[PDB]
């Protein structure tokens, strides 16, 4: 899944569906919060708004 | 269909069509970087180099 466009890719390019606090592994979420104030990961993952 | 005031000068009309431009950069391995690109109403990308 990379070469297709259309119907599957809406989900996987994050214009709909899961947040970036739900699409990441639950240890990378922890890392992001704890190292928030020293090295932000804020602009590195996009949160869909629908 | 637009209606504009006359102007002596030749002019352009810049119509921006607001879409989604989204790139998703994946690095599977070191020294390897890839991207999948998507634009939806005007189709584009999908690792088009």
């Amino acid at each position: 899944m990379a070469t297709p466009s259309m119907l599957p890719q809406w989900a996987y390019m994050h214009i709909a569906g899961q947040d970036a606090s739900e699409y990441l592994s639950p240890g990378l979420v922890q890392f992001a919060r704890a190292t928030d104030t020293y090295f932000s990961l804020g602009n590195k993952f996009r949160n869909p708004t629908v | 269909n637009f209606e504009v005031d006359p102007m002596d000068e030749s002019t352009l009309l810049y119509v921006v069509f607001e879409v989604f431009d989204v790139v998703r950069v994946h690095q599977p391995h070191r020294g390897v970087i890839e991207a999948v690109y998507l634009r939806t109403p005007f189709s584009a990308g999908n690792a088009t180099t």
Binding site: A20, A32, G42, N43, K44, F45, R46 | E18
Partner: peptide, 7 residues
Amino acid sequence: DINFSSL
């Protein structure tokens, strides 16, 4: 209109 994020 306009997509951007803060996480």
